[PDB]
Amino acid sequence: MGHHHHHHSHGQQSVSNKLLAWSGVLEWQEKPKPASVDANTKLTRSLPCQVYVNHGENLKTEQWPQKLIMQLIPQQLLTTLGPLFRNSRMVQFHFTNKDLESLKGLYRIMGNGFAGCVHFPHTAPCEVRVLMLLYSSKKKIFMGLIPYDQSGFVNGIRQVITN
């Protein structure tokens, strides 16, 4: 896809003062039923999401893909991963504007007490495998906890897959 008309300039206030590290598409599958069929042609949602790091942050990003895949799981079960949310790198997702209707879909999902495990493809020679997207209904910002652990966090998410 030769993107001739490439889009630019979306630095609307949502953070206090953070720098833009990454800008690409976050796509996921909604889980409306624990049993039906669950294949392609389900509830597919996708937004242009922006990852803001804290100015001189260790995260170089760069080699990260133009698109990441996210997993909708109940936030009830994440309470078991207590230390895995404390040993993490807290960043913010602007989602390029906050008034999108597919984004109001994501406000609805996480408003029902759900969360989004963002599983990365091939990014860079050792950096980020996975992070947890957690919307703050308090401060109206989307959070991204990157556990410096990574591997043991995945083992937790594997057990949360059940049902």
PDB file of C-alpha atoms in Angstrom:
ATOM      1  CA  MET A   1       0.000   0.000   0.000  1.00  0.00           C
ATOM      2  CA  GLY A   2       1.897   3.089  -1.328  1.00  0.00           C
ATOM      3  CA  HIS A   3       0.599   5.782   1.128  1.00  0.00           C
ATOM      4  CA  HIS A   4       0.872   8.969  -1.061  1.00  0.00           C
ATOM      5  CA  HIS A   5      -1.476  11.109   1.134  1.00  0.00           C
ATOM      6  CA  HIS A   6       0.255  10.422   4.530  1.00  0.00           C
ATOM      7  CA  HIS A   7      -1.390  12.209   7.551  1.00  0.00           C
ATOM      8  CA  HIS A   8       0.426  14.454  10.122  1.00  0.00           C
ATOM      9  CA  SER A   9       0.032  16.939  13.110  1.00  0.00           C
ATOM     10  CA  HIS A  10      -2.044  15.508  16.051  1.00  0.00           C
ATOM     11  CA  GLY A  11      -0.521  16.767  19.362  1.00  0.00           C
ATOM     12  CA  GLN A  12      -3.796  17.589  21.213  1.00  0.00           C
ATOM     13  CA  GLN A  13      -3.490  17.874  25.056  1.00  0.00           C
ATOM     14  CA  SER A  14      -4.333  14.696  27.102  1.00  0.00           C
ATOM     15  CA  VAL A  15      -0.982  14.098  28.892  1.00  0.00           C
ATOM     16  CA  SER A  16       0.667  16.801  31.122  1.00  0.00           C
ATOM     17  CA  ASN A  17       4.026  16.990  29.180  1.00  0.00           C
ATOM     18  CA  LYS A  18       5.122  13.731  27.386  1.00  0.00           C
ATOM     19  CA  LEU A  19       6.883  13.171  23.982  1.00  0.00           C
ATOM     20  CA  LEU A  20       5.397  11.065  21.113  1.00  0.00           C
ATOM     21  CA  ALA A  21       7.386   7.764  20.805  1.00  0.00           C
ATOM     22  CA  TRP A  22       5.085   5.702  18.497  1.00  0.00           C
ATOM     23  CA  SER A  23       2.057   6.301  16.172  1.00  0.00           C
ATOM     24  CA  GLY A  24       0.189   3.367  14.494  1.00  0.00           C
ATOM     25  CA  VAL A  25      -3.038   1.259  14.411  1.00  0.00           C
ATOM     26  CA  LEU A  26      -4.254  -0.770  17.475  1.00  0.00           C
ATOM     27  CA  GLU A  27      -6.679  -3.559  16.288  1.00  0.00           C
ATOM     28  CA  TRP A  28      -8.589  -6.069  18.503  1.00  0.00           C
ATOM     29  CA  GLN A  29     -11.470  -8.597  18.628  1.00  0.00           C
ATOM     30  CA  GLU A  30     -14.492  -8.061  20.948  1.00  0.00           C
ATOM     31  CA  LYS A  31     -15.594 -11.076  23.067  1.00  0.00           C
ATOM     32  CA  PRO A  32     -19.505 -10.736  23.250  1.00  0.00           C
ATOM     33  CA  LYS A  33     -20.129 -14.458  24.130  1.00  0.00           C
ATOM     34  CA  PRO A  34     -17.877 -17.242  25.732  1.00  0.00           C
ATOM     35  CA  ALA A  35     -19.579 -19.715  23.253  1.00  0.00           C
ATOM     36  CA  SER A  36     -21.035 -19.224  19.694  1.00  0.00           C
ATOM     37  CA  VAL A  37     -18.370 -20.063  17.023  1.00  0.00           C
ATOM     38  CA  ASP A  38     -15.652 -17.349  17.491  1.00  0.00           C
ATOM     39  CA  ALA A  39     -13.689 -17.044  14.176  1.00  0.00           C
ATOM     40  CA  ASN A  40     -13.223 -14.240  11.535  1.00  0.00           C
ATOM     41  CA  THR A  41     -16.241 -11.922  10.636  1.00  0.00           C
ATOM     42  CA  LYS A  42     -16.643 -11.164  14.459  1.00  0.00           C
ATOM     43  CA  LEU A  43     -16.683  -7.655  16.108  1.00  0.00           C
ATOM     44  CA  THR A  44     -13.435  -6.198  14.578  1.00  0.00           C
ATOM     45  CA  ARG A  45     -12.391  -2.736  15.944  1.00  0.00           C
ATOM     46  CA  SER A  46      -9.256  -0.622  15.090  1.00  0.00           C
ATOM     47  CA  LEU A  47      -8.032   2.920  16.054  1.00  0.00           C
ATOM     48  CA  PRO A  48      -4.888   5.071  15.225  1.00  0.00           C
ATOM     49  CA  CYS A  49      -3.203   5.020  18.726  1.00  0.00           C
ATOM     50  CA  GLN A  50      -0.282   7.246  19.893  1.00  0.00           C
ATOM     51  CA  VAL A  51       2.180   6.073  22.651  1.00  0.00           C
ATOM     52  CA  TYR A  52       3.540   9.039  24.726  1.00  0.00           C
ATOM     53  CA  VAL A  53       6.764   8.374  26.753  1.00  0.00           C
ATOM     54  CA  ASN A  54       8.135  10.660  29.546  1.00  0.00           C
ATOM     55  CA  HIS A  55      10.616  12.859  27.492  1.00  0.00           C
ATOM     56  CA  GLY A  56      14.067  11.167  28.066  1.00  0.00           C
ATOM     57  CA  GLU A  57      12.595   7.649  28.505  1.00  0.00           C
ATOM     58  CA  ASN A  58      14.648   4.399  27.907  1.00  0.00           C
ATOM     59  CA  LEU A  59      12.015   3.261  25.266  1.00  0.00           C
ATOM     60  CA  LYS A  60      13.600   3.907  21.764  1.00  0.00           C
ATOM     61  CA  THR A  61      10.542   2.362  19.896  1.00  0.00           C
ATOM     62  CA  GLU A  62      11.714   3.020  16.185  1.00  0.00           C
ATOM     63  CA  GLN A  63      11.567  -0.624  14.826  1.00  0.00           C
ATOM     64  CA  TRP A  64       7.996  -1.161  16.266  1.00  0.00           C
ATOM     65  CA  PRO A  65       5.353  -2.160  13.528  1.00  0.00           C
ATOM     66  CA  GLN A  66       2.714   0.191  11.928  1.00  0.00           C
ATOM     67  CA  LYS A  67       0.022  -1.957  13.692  1.00  0.00           C
ATOM     68  CA  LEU A  68      -0.327  -3.827  17.094  1.00  0.00           C
ATOM     69  CA  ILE A  69      -2.910  -6.544  18.124  1.00  0.00           C
ATOM     70  CA  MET A  70      -4.833  -6.306  21.474  1.00  0.00           C
ATOM     71  CA  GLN A  71      -6.754  -8.961  23.561  1.00  0.00           C
ATOM     72  CA  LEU A  72     -10.026  -8.050  25.447  1.00  0.00           C
ATOM     73  CA  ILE A  73     -10.033  -9.939  28.816  1.00  0.00           C
ATOM     74  CA  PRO A  74     -12.043  -9.265  32.121  1.00  0.00           C
ATOM     75  CA  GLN A  75     -10.144  -6.952  34.585  1.00  0.00           C
ATOM     76  CA  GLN A  76     -11.534  -9.141  37.506  1.00  0.00           C
ATOM     77  CA  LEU A  77      -8.863 -11.832  36.735  1.00  0.00           C
ATOM     78  CA  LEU A  78      -5.981  -9.246  36.466  1.00  0.00           C
ATOM     79  CA  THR A  79      -6.089  -8.814  40.328  1.00  0.00           C
ATOM     80  CA  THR A  80      -3.966 -12.081  40.468  1.00  0.00           C
ATOM     81  CA  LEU A  81      -1.200 -10.230  38.467  1.00  0.00           C
ATOM     82  CA  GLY A  82      -0.789  -7.603  41.309  1.00  0.00           C
ATOM     83  CA  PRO A  83       3.140  -7.464  41.282  1.00  0.00           C
ATOM     84  CA  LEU A  84       3.059  -7.676  37.384  1.00  0.00           C
ATOM     85  CA  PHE A  85       1.286  -4.208  37.346  1.00  0.00           C
ATOM     86  CA  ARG A  86       3.807  -2.689  39.892  1.00  0.00           C
ATOM     87  CA  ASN A  87       7.031  -3.806  38.024  1.00  0.00           C
ATOM     88  CA  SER A  88       5.745  -1.931  34.885  1.00  0.00           C
ATOM     89  CA  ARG A  89       6.462   1.140  32.672  1.00  0.00           C
ATOM     90  CA  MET A  90       3.440   3.496  32.828  1.00  0.00           C
ATOM     91  CA  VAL A  91       2.846   5.368  29.469  1.00  0.00           C
ATOM     92  CA  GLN A  92      -0.295   7.046  27.932  1.00  0.00           C
ATOM     93  CA  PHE A  93      -2.287   6.326  24.694  1.00  0.00           C
ATOM     94  CA  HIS A  94      -3.867   9.508  23.114  1.00  0.00           C
ATOM     95  CA  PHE A  95      -5.620   7.419  20.333  1.00  0.00           C
ATOM     96  CA  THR A  96      -5.335  10.512  17.968  1.00  0.00           C
ATOM     97  CA  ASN A  97      -8.374  12.615  19.218  1.00  0.00           C
ATOM     98  CA  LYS A  98     -10.783  11.255  21.988  1.00  0.00           C
ATOM     99  CA  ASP A  99     -14.186  11.802  20.191  1.00  0.00           C
ATOM    100  CA  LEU A 100     -14.195   8.736  17.795  1.00  0.00           C
ATOM    101  CA  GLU A 101     -17.288   6.361  17.835  1.00  0.00           C
ATOM    102  CA  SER A 102     -15.121   3.123  17.636  1.00  0.00           C
ATOM    103  CA  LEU A 103     -13.153   4.697  20.550  1.00  0.00           C
ATOM    104  CA  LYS A 104     -16.542   5.280  22.365  1.00  0.00           C
ATOM    105  CA  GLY A 105     -16.944   1.522  21.794  1.00  0.00           C
ATOM    106  CA  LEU A 106     -13.628   1.049  23.736  1.00  0.00           C
ATOM    107  CA  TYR A 107     -14.906   3.537  26.467  1.00  0.00           C
ATOM    108  CA  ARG A 108     -17.986   1.186  26.694  1.00  0.00           C
ATOM    109  CA  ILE A 109     -15.964  -2.131  26.895  1.00  0.00           C
ATOM    110  CA  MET A 110     -13.530  -0.899  29.644  1.00  0.00           C
ATOM    111  CA  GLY A 111     -16.507   0.917  31.304  1.00  0.00           C
ATOM    112  CA  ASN A 112     -18.008  -2.618  31.828  1.00  0.00           C
ATOM    113  CA  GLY A 113     -14.767  -3.597  33.736  1.00  0.00           C
ATOM    114  CA  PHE A 114     -12.579  -5.017  30.892  1.00  0.00           C
ATOM    115  CA  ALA A 115      -8.921  -4.539  29.834  1.00  0.00           C
ATOM    116  CA  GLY A 116      -6.681  -4.862  26.722  1.00  0.00           C
ATOM    117  CA  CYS A 117      -3.509  -7.076  26.602  1.00  0.00           C
ATOM    118  CA  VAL A 118      -1.527  -5.558  23.634  1.00  0.00           C
ATOM    119  CA  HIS A 119       0.541  -8.475  22.167  1.00  0.00           C
ATOM    120  CA  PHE A 120       3.369  -7.071  19.935  1.00  0.00           C
ATOM    121  CA  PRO A 121       4.626  -8.821  16.670  1.00  0.00           C
ATOM    122  CA  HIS A 122       8.421  -8.673  15.762  1.00  0.00           C
ATOM    123  CA  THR A 123       9.512  -5.173  17.019  1.00  0.00           C
ATOM    124  CA  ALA A 124      13.253  -4.712  17.972  1.00  0.00           C
ATOM    125  CA  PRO A 125      16.267  -6.961  19.140  1.00  0.00           C
ATOM    126  CA  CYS A 126      15.008  -7.346  22.796  1.00  0.00           C
ATOM    127  CA  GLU A 127      12.697  -4.537  24.123  1.00  0.00           C
ATOM    128  CA  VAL A 128       8.808  -4.931  24.349  1.00  0.00           C
ATOM    129  CA  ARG A 129       6.960  -8.293  23.973  1.00  0.00           C
ATOM    130  CA  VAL A 130       3.572  -7.136  25.501  1.00  0.00           C
ATOM    131  CA  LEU A 131       1.814  -4.323  27.538  1.00  0.00           C
ATOM    132  CA  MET A 132      -1.575  -3.842  29.328  1.00  0.00           C
ATOM    133  CA  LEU A 133      -3.957  -1.102  28.050  1.00  0.00           C
ATOM    134  CA  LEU A 134      -6.062   0.118  31.072  1.00  0.00           C
ATOM    135  CA  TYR A 135      -8.520   3.054  30.686  1.00  0.00           C
ATOM    136  CA  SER A 136      -8.741   5.465  33.683  1.00  0.00           C
ATOM    137  CA  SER A 137     -12.465   6.431  34.104  1.00  0.00           C
ATOM    138  CA  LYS A 138     -11.052   8.733  36.863  1.00  0.00           C
ATOM    139  CA  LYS A 139      -8.488  10.867  34.854  1.00  0.00           C
ATOM    140  CA  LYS A 140     -10.060  10.206  31.341  1.00  0.00           C
ATOM    141  CA  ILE A 141      -6.672   8.878  29.934  1.00  0.00           C
ATOM    142  CA  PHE A 142      -5.760   5.420  28.460  1.00  0.00           C
ATOM    143  CA  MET A 143      -2.778   3.868  30.376  1.00  0.00           C
ATOM    144  CA  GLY A 144      -0.150   1.394  29.021  1.00  0.00           C
ATOM    145  CA  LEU A 145       1.695  -0.702  31.659  1.00  0.00           C
ATOM    146  CA  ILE A 146       4.855  -2.343  30.103  1.00  0.00           C
ATOM    147  CA  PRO A 147       6.055  -4.952  32.787  1.00  0.00           C
ATOM    148  CA  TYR A 148       9.947  -5.009  32.664  1.00  0.00           C
ATOM    149  CA  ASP A 149       9.388  -8.736  33.456  1.00  0.00           C
ATOM    150  CA  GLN A 150       7.328  -9.342  30.138  1.00  0.00           C
ATOM    151  CA  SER A 151       7.734 -13.226  30.048  1.00  0.00           C
ATOM    152  CA  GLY A 152       6.045 -14.084  33.435  1.00  0.00           C
ATOM    153  CA  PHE A 153       3.254 -11.566  32.640  1.00  0.00           C
ATOM    154  CA  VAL A 154       2.477 -13.608  29.437  1.00  0.00           C
ATOM    155  CA  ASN A 155       2.223 -16.810  31.667  1.00  0.00           C
ATOM    156  CA  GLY A 156      -0.415 -14.909  33.726  1.00  0.00           C
ATOM    157  CA  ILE A 157      -2.360 -13.783  30.572  1.00  0.00           C
ATOM    158  CA  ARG A 158      -2.332 -17.463  29.294  1.00  0.00           C
ATOM    159  CA  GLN A 159      -4.344 -18.509  32.426  1.00  0.00           C
ATOM    160  CA  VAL A 160      -6.730 -15.459  31.974  1.00  0.00           C
ATOM    161  CA  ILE A 161      -7.537 -16.778  28.380  1.00  0.00           C
ATOM    162  CA  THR A 162      -9.837 -19.466  30.056  1.00  0.00           C
ATOM    163  CA  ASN A 163     -13.629 -18.971  29.210  1.00  0.00           C
TER     164      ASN A 163
END
